Structure formats: structure tokens, C-alpha cells
Symmetry: D2
């Protein structure tokens, strides 16, 4: 297990941006700008910097051209400039590789620390960022599918309890999780900013980035994204949804960018800011835990996720999960799920719900 440092944890505000390596910058621009409507904060021949409708920091997404599509950094904003120093001491005590750039790794971020964290993920911590025009009332720019905030990340990692404890020490609080009666944990959601999560852990082979999630105002905004993808005849890039989540209670959609990076669109989870916020544990065999309406979870959702890079820009080696697989125990040949616990009517054995194998 990952020891708790004696050094104080940095005070993390929220998830702030991701840097994604993409192979074809123009095709990625098409997707994030022309399809999804994100707002350009800066661009050149090598990178595109993008933000959501309500953001005032420089960006929520950096697309960087490179040879291998991968997550390069998932960045958290910290409360004060001194929290970057705290982050550096903390990860140094953990024995992690760190790199400090006083003028930042990407445009519009100042003093920043990147680390290869104990789960193999490239985290950035920063305070300083260039403020830009907050577009929250620019209804002359507002899209029918407008993405309004960056909401969270979701990470694939083999040992969820191990990661959970490490994130708890860093000040994240678990809001919801998925377990079975045998005591296996399959997934956990944890927050700093007072929503259901800022990052989440999904059990599986890792380190891999499962998705980045953006918010909309209303459910019809998410519908419109689907409708637009149909009109553009790219409905094959709709992976899963739209649906209502069990965990989080949010309305959701998962789509795939040109490099198969998964993006979640999300709205209307609940407030978690009180320190005794009640934690919700779902049973892995509950067929309403993921999609509340009982729609089946496509296998690619469980098996596919993005590579992540180390600080040299090389792909991180993957460690295979040895705990039980959520896919296998729910929709695989020996799996099952229920609608009502203890009722064989509305239960599914060795296949998924709604009549699919």
C-alpha cells in the first residue's frame, strides 16, 4: 500500500484540464470545435487549447499533436501558489518522479508540477493560470449542445482500494462505489469540489484514462449532441447512452474522439460538499447501478481506455487487474444481474439485459 506522507497534502480545488495527445490535429479540431462546440483559447500548428462555456481559466483541454494518442497530463488546480511546493514535497516523499516548470508545461498555465503518480498517472498541479473572457452569458455563441464545465476524470487502475486510500490521503472523499458481497471493489468516485467526483477509479488494466467528462446545463443539450452526430453520420462514435446513471444520478452520454479517447457528457448530479455526505455503495449485480433504466453496458466500455504517458512522453506499461472483472461477473458467460434483488424475473444470466449477448 501507498504510505501517507508526513508532508502536508496540497489543497486541491478541482479538476481543471487534460492534455491529450492526438495523431491528426485537424481531425481532432473538427471533433472538439466543430462537432462539440468547445471554445478556442489559443491555437497553432501543434496544439489547440479549448475551454467550456462557463470557464475563466485559460483552458479545460489541450490537444497536442504527437505520434501516439494518449493522456499526457490530467491537471488539478490547487488553492494557492504554495500548494505547488506542497505537491512537490508530497510526491517526492512518495518516491515519485516529478518535474517542476516555473513557467508551465502548456500555454496559459504558470508554475506547475507534473508527477508520475503512484498509480502511474501523469498528474499536474498548478495555481497560476491566465484568465480569459468567461463566456457564461455569451448566448450569441451558445450551441444547442453546449458544454458548460469540465466536470471530472475517470481512471482505470487494477487495485481500486489501493488507489482509493491514496486519493483519500490527498483529500478526495469517496461519494459512491460498487462492491460485491465477497468484498471486491469494482469502482469508486471521489471529489474535492462538492460534486459526485473530480476523479474516479474504474477497476481494470492500468494505468489508462477511461474518460474526461464535461457538463451541460440540461438533458436536452445531451440529446442534441446525439442528434447532431446522427446528422453528421457519425453515430458509430456514440459508444453508450444517453442514459440516467445509477451512481451519481446524472444524465449521461459517452462518445469517442478520432483517436478513440472517450468523452462523457454529463448533467445534474447532486451536492456532496458536507464532510459527512452519505456514501452510497451499490452491488455489482444490480442492473440499475450504472444505467438506471437497465440498459446494457457495452463491453467496450469495460475493456477500452486510453494510454497514458510518463514524463518523457513514453507510454506507461500496463498492469493487469487480478481482482474479479465487472464485465465478467455481470454480462459474461458466468455473469448475472438483477432488476429486483432476489427476483429471477428481470434477472439476466450469462448475457446482458434487454435481450442482447
Amino acid at each position: 500500500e501507498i504510505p501517507k506522507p508526513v508532508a502536508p497534502a496540497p489543497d486541491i480545488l478541482r479538476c481543471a484540464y487534460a492534455e491529450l495527445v492526438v495523431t491528426d490535429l485537424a481531425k481532432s479540431r473538427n471533433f472538439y470545435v466543430d462537432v462539440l462546440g468547445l471554445h478556442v483559447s489559443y491555437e497553432d500548428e501543434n496544439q489547440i487549447y479549448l475551454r467550456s462555456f462557463e470557464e475563466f481559466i485559460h483552458h479545460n483541454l489541450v490537444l497536442t499533436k504527437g505520434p501516439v494518442a494518449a493522456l499526457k497530463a490530467m491537471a488539478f488546480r490547487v488553492r494557492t501558489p504554495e500548494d505547488v511546493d506542497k505537491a512537490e514535497a508530497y510526491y517526492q516523499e512518495l518516491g515519485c518522479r516529478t518535474e517542476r516548470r516555473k513557467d508551465g508545461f502548456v500555454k496559459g498555465i504558470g508554475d506547475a508540477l507534473r508527477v508520475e503518480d503512484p498509480l502511474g498517472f501523469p498528474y499536474e498541479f498548478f495555481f497560476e493560470t491566465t484568465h480569459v473572457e468567461r463566456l457564461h452569458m455569451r448566448y450569441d455563441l451558445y450551441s444547442a449542445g453546449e458544454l458548460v464545465r469540465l466536470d471530472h476524470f475517470n481512471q482505470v487502475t487494477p487495485d481500486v482500494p489501493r488507489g482509493r486510500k491514496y486519493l483519500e490521503d490527498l483529500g478526495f472523499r469517496v461519494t459512491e462505489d460498487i462492491q460485491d458481497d465477497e468484498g471486491t471493489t469494482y469502482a469508486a468516485w471521489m471529489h474535492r469540489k462538492g460534486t459526485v467526483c473530480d476523479t474516479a477509479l474504474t477497476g481494470g488494466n492500468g494505468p489508462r484514462l477511461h474518460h474526461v467528462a464535461f457538463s451541460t446545463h440540461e438533458k436536452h443539450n445531451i440529446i442534441q449532441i446525439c442528434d447532431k452526430m446522427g446528422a453528421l453520420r457519425i453515430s458509430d462514435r456514440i459508444e453508450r447512452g444517453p442514459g440516467r446513471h445509477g451512481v451519481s444520478n446524472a444524465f449521461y452520454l459517452y462518445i469517442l474522439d478520432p483517436d478513440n479517447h472517450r468523452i462523457e457528457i454529463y448533467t445534474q448530479d447532486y451536492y456532496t460538499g458536507d464532510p459527512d455526505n452519505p456514501t452510497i455503495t451499490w452491488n455489482v449485480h444490480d442492473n440499475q447501478r450504472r444505467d438506471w433504466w437497465g440498459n446494457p453496458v457495452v463491453p467496450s466500455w469495460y475493456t477500452e481506455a486510453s494510454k497514458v504517458l510518463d514524463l518523457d512522453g513514453n507510454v506507461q506499461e500496463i498492469i493487469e487487474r487480478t481482482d474479479d472483472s465487472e464485465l465478467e461477473v455481470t454480462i459474461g458467460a458466468d455473469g448475472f444481474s438483477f432488476t429486483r434483488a432476489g427476483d429471477e424475473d428481470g434477472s439476466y444470466h450469462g448475457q446482458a439485459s434487454k435481450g442482447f449477448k
Copy 2:
């Protein structure tokens, strides 16, 4: 081929109500009233008469207790009392069995003609009906899932072209249809009231009733029905959806009542009332034709449908479709669908879209 009568067709206004035979009147009441929120016009120990939020005629749905769950009548309102005379002469010329009752078959309907039509379906034609309180501004009653109108019926019949010609002679105009490149028709939608349909034909073994559809005002009302069914832990009665249709462009959901009668919830199709309204023909292998977002159509949607009765109340014998099956050609072991015509990428061979078999 069904001949065109010399006798003038009745002027049909719209689909008006269905009479469904149900086996447990209390369990059906719980579904239609407590779950779905339909409004009771009249009830006793044998029947429940239900209407939608904006209706002023007596009812849109009659639940009749009986031994075998089935459609007993699908009723269309005609423009004048004299149109019921026209209907009787028309169907008599077609050689169809008819029955006229000057004081109605069900409460709140006056002079009414029931027929066993050329496709084996029990049609009713009526003008006279008891007006009731139109609840369209009763927002003190309005449900988060409120059903606002009856929109259409959908019939399973083995020979779609044969049925289409008959309905056209009767004054219905085809709005959309599904065909392939080998001369087969799989489905057609046709209207009187200036929406995408009043009734529709689905290719399959029949006569059977595929579904009855009710409208909501907005898409979030359909999402609420799903959310409520999750909370009631009856998500296993959500068959398909929610989604955006290709055909009709409506937002939709299909659910199953306690006798497996299929109900569609529907909103926001388009105006068809101009006589040169452009017809839209989809290819049966186009994976956006049914669900615009490419979500797979569950096999039960193709295979399951309700019995229909003759005028003596006996189940109509089912005649097998010999034309190609939409299920088989799209999602069966030798099926095919595409996202983009001519593009191998995003096509599906011998399985359904989005990872499922």
C-alpha cells in the same frame, strides 16, 4: 390486391381510441393510472376509460377485463355522422364483416361501426362522442411524465404493400417507409391528421397490434417515465429506448404493460398535412433508420406483438410473413447494417450495433 370501392371513403379525422382487453384490471389500472398518469373518465369493475391530458372526447383508451389479452378495437373518428354511413357502405362493398350500433360499443361513444377489415383488424368508425372536461390547462394535475395526446397505432401485417394500397384508398397518405434494393417493403407510416402517422404497418406475422402511441410535450417528460420506472424497480418493462427515431424524427420510448401490450411514448414529429408532403424512404440496412443514434433494436421489438380479436371477440388467426424479415436482414446471423452507405467502417455483419449480438 384489395380493390378500390365505387363507394366513397369515409372522411377520417384521426386515430381516437383503442379498446384493449386486459386480464387483471387492477394491475392494468396501476400501470396506466399510477405509473403513467392517464386520467380516468369512467370506471367500474369491468372497464376503465382513460384519456390523455389534452383530450375532450370521452376517452383515448378503454381497458376491458377479459380472458385473453388482445386488441378489441382500434377506433378512428370521422368528420360527420353521415361518414359512419359511408364507412358501412365502403366496407360492405369490400366484402368485410360489419356491425353497426346506434348507441355505441363502449361508454361515451354513440353511433359506431365496427369492421373486420381486409387485413383482419378490428376497426371502429364513429362521430358521436360524449365531451368531457378538457384537462389541457390543469397544471395542478400535470405529471412530470404527462401523456398529452393519443398519437397513433402500429399494426403488424405480413404483406405491407397490400395493406398500404388499401389504406391509401381509404384516404391515408404514406409519409415514410422502409424498403430494400430487392423490391421488399418492411414498414410504412400513413396519416390523416397531419402528423407522421395515424396508423402504421410493420411487416411481420399478423394481424397483431404492435403498439399504441401517446405524445408528451417535451423530451424530458419521456426521460421522466424512464426515471420513474427505475425508481419503481420496474426497469425490466422498458423494452427499447429512449431514443430519436430516424423515421418520423420523433423522440421515443417503448414500454410494456402488464399483459405485454406495447406502449410508445412519442414527441416532436413534423407537419405532413400538405397533399404533396415529401415521402421519405429509408433503406432497411441503414442503422440510423429506426434509432437515429444507431442504438440496436432489441429482437423482441421485431417478434412480439398483441393478439387482435374479431367481432365475436375471438382471437384472429395469425398468417405468416413470407417476405424477408427486418430482424433477420439487419441483426440476425446473416444480417447487415451500415452507418454510412458504402463505408465498411461503422458497419455490422451478423450482429447488432454497439457491441451486441
Copy 3:
């Protein structure tokens, strides 16, 4: 009273388009295209042809440059080419001036009849029109405020019963109206296509055009139009709303184009297509009849409306209403309105609701 002709009425399908004369074509284009998002079917230096998201006929709105802003024609589509002949015979029997153009008055319309109707309004009847790409599934184009259909017209005329009878003979059925207990009709709504209206009559000096109405899919689309107008710092062009109507039960908004032509945005009225559809009569003093939430009706809504042209292109002379004024009897100095019939509590005497008086 206007006689019922012996000649059969044309079979009218629906309101189809309006031709509005505008003074500055580029400013008008900015409003209808850049602000409101209507789709351009054709344009040149003299005219802009616009359609809604779900339309397949050539256009729903023609903007024509000219010296005096006005309604030039309100056009109804008829069921068959033969109905254009029927319309011509019908209006000739009424003694009205008519003009027939075999190849249309505006682009994308074929054989068309324009008439100076008995209320002084320029009506067009046509069947033939150039079909265009129906954009109803073009969600790549869909705006957060998208206008999806043309819904109706609303006309200001001094004598509502006179107009009502004439339109009923033409086959429109009244769906709702506003009357008082002393025999006065203040407004009526009437349809062909099975919505609350295709045209409507509002009591006042006329002929003038009160508004043209377009639909949206959902209420949030109307909210977005307001939000966008705020962002563009043209909220002064929001005249009234948004609200819920009593009459029609639709969610609504009224805005003003650059020549002060009034546009209604509208959604979620109810089905009226049955021939015995119940007619709803509201009392003029009911403060929920126009805005269901009781918000006050701005005086300009009652006083301001667009000029209309005759067939020569000259403005029609205005005839003064002599019947009682809706403005005066509800929000004027001797006006009255109620929230609950017979309850003094929530009534308004000599002023508007919600703490306001006439400016």
C-alpha cells in the same frame, strides 16, 4: 355583414408565408437570419426568402425592400391547383379586387391569386411552390433557438364579429375568443390545419398586421431567444413575454423586427382538428386570459401593429374601432381585471397587474 357566396370556398390547408416590406434589407437580414436563425432559400439586393427548419415549400417569409414598411401579402396554401380558381370566383362574388399571376408574385410560388379581402387585408392563395431541402433532421444546423414552423398570422380589425363570420364561411373554425358580458368581442382565433390558429383577429383600428408567429420544439428554445437578445444587447426589442398564454395554452414571446414588425415565437398549443372542437370563451376581465401567470400586457401590444398594402402597393387607410377597447377596459383608467371571478382580492382597478400602471 359579409354575405356567404354561392360559389364554393377554396380548400385552404394552412398559413404558408408572409411577404413583409422592409426599409433596410441588410438590417432585416441581420434580425431574421443572424439573430433568429431562419434559413435562406434565395436572396438578392431586393429580397430575402426565408424558411423554417421543418419546411419543404420554398419559403415562409419574404422580405422585400421598399419605401414603407408594411405587410404586402399573407399567403395561404390551398389543397389543389383548382382551389386557386375557386378562390378567385369566391372573392369576385364578394366584390373584392383580385389579381391573378400564372407564374407567381414572388419567387418559388407558381400560379397565385392576390386579393384585397373584405377587411382590407392582402391575402394570397396558391398551390404551386418550388420544393426545397427539408431541414428537419439537419441537427448539424440546429440552433439553440431554432424556429421550426410557421404557425399563424394575427390581424387587427375594427369589427371582430364581422370578420369572424366571413372567415367561418371561408372554412376557418373559431377555437378561442375573448368577449365580455355586454356583447363585445375583443379577439378571436381560427384555424384550418388543426392547431389553435392559422389566422386570428384582434380588435383595433385596421386593417393592420398584428404579428406573424413561428413555432419552436420546446420552451427552452424560446428562453434561448431571449437570452441571445440579452447577449446581443437588444433586449429592448423584446416587447412582451416570455409567458404562458391563457388563450391557446402556448408558451410565447413577442419581439420586434427593425421596422417594428412584430414576431411571435410560440410552442405547445393543442389539437383542434375535430369539427366540434370546443370553443373556449374567456372574459376580457380575466387577468389569466392572455398571460396565464397574470403578467401585465404591455400597452404597445394593444396599440401598435404594421401597415398593410393594397394590390397597387399603397398603404390601406385605417378604420377606427368603435367597439370597446381591450386596453381601456382592462388596464386603462376605468379598467378592471380579476384573478378569481367574484373575488376582490387579486383584482385590479384602473391599473395593470403586478404593481404597474400605463406609462
Copy 4:
């Protein structure tokens, strides 16, 4: 008001209000039958109500009494120890305090009430009885469902004096309304990372302007209006619905049976970063309150609820001497603009959209 040496309590959020109501049954009809709030406890004396997503015992306590008024506006603090900190903080300010180890109302434990420097009855507590969180109970969900308590708004005569005091208590200003000659008319300030938890409106005070509840979506607010029309109580819709300038939220103001003002609110923005950009509006900007330029009804500026001291007696009102927002915008000498510097779309001596004061 000086900054104490004693540390401020760590305040999480607004948590509940206790309103005194004169007829408990009529108030129940409004809050439960009209608005759909959920009952956590009730008897002949009190009704305890919560929103759809709440897990603490209540967001609103309706207490029967002779004079309708705010009795307490309560904030939840982060730890039990923060209640001790609140007590020492307000004692150093010289304010009257009362501590009850077992609470003032049911479902709250150790609690401190104070008559604060602006005359308002604040409560601070940590301990509360958890209840069933109804957030997925879509079998109960109303077309107008109130999902959270969002904020309070207080009327006080000197906004800068109040603002400085709340800043010392850890609230951060998000937005405000000023004029060019240095008068402040209103300020909004937060702890939980929304546009506010409490807010100050310039006017005679102390009075409680409103309590605000959230919905999920804008159509839920529309439904509340529609329902009030159907119930033929549209006269209790005071103002709206609208889009706010300040906050950018969709809104509605309605009046309960004792004229307590309730706001329904949705879709403001995230303010939790410590350098969150502040926004200051000019008082003459006709889009600052209603973004669409709809007129602000005069009662919104003039009417607000009494507040009580710790003995249950009404607090004396102190008159505002700074300029009045009503007078400078919609009064006979008032003005507002749509575009700064433009006479077109400006209003002089009356409100927008063709109305003057009734």
C-alpha cells in the same frame, strides 16, 4: 465592524431557515401541496420540510406564532468544534448569543444562535439527524420539484458595512451592483461555490428578502407558474419568470400565505476558485436584474419579511440613507439603459416595456 482575533467558524453552506407563520395549515398547503416539499416531521406547532436531494433533517421549519417573521437563518459548519468557534467569534463582536447543546429545533443538535451585527438571527450548527436522501425517488418527483436549498437574501441599509463583516466570516463576493458615484445597492457572497449562500440587498432592515430553492431545469420553474395559474393563485406570482443578469440563473419569485418571498432558481455558475472573477454591474443597466430587460416590480424593492431577536420579538428597522435602487431606476426621476450611452432603449421616469409605477 471589526475583524475579531478569534478565528471565524468554517461555514459549509446555508442549511435551513425557520419562518414563523400565522396559520400552519394554510402554510402547509403552500409549501407541501403547491410546492411539493417533503415532510421530515410535523405536529400542531411546526412543519419540518426538505428538498428532493437533501440528506440533513430539513431545509425549512415552519413554526406557528403570532407574528410572521424570520426566526433563524441557519448555516452548517464543517466540524463540531466550529460551533465553539462561532460562539467565541460573536462574543468578541459583542453580540448576544445563545447556545443549546441539544438544538433549537428538531433534527439539529448542538447549535448557537446569535443576534448578528446587522440585527439578523443566525444559527450555526454541525450535528443534524440524517434522513432518507430522496434524490432518486422519481416515483415522488413533481413537475416543479424543488431539489436544493440554494441561498438567503437579506435587506440591510448599509451594504458595504455588511459586506466587510461577511467577508471576515469567510464569505467571498461574487457579484454586486453599484453606481458611478460610489453607492452600492446589492452584493452576493458565497461559501459553497455557487453565486451565493447569502446576499445583501440595500434597504430598510434587518428584513429577510427571500429564501431560494433550486430546480434541475428551467421547465420546472415554468411548471410552478403554470400550476399557480391552474390553482387561480397567479396573484401570488410576484416577479418573473426570468433570466437573471447577476448570477445568470433562471428565476421566479412567489409569495407564501404570510407574504414571505420564495425564489425558485436554477443554473448559476461555479465560484469555488479563490480568484473567481467578480462582476460589478451598473445600477442603471436594465439587464442587471432581469437579463431580458423586463421591469422589476416595485414590491420587490419595498417589501420583505420581519426578523426576530432571540426572545422572539421583532427587530427594529433602521432606514437606509444611501440612494434607493427603485428610485434611481424606475421612479419618476429614475432611468435605465439597454446599451450604455444609448438613448434608444433607455427609460426615463418609468420602467421598461411601457409601464410606470402603480
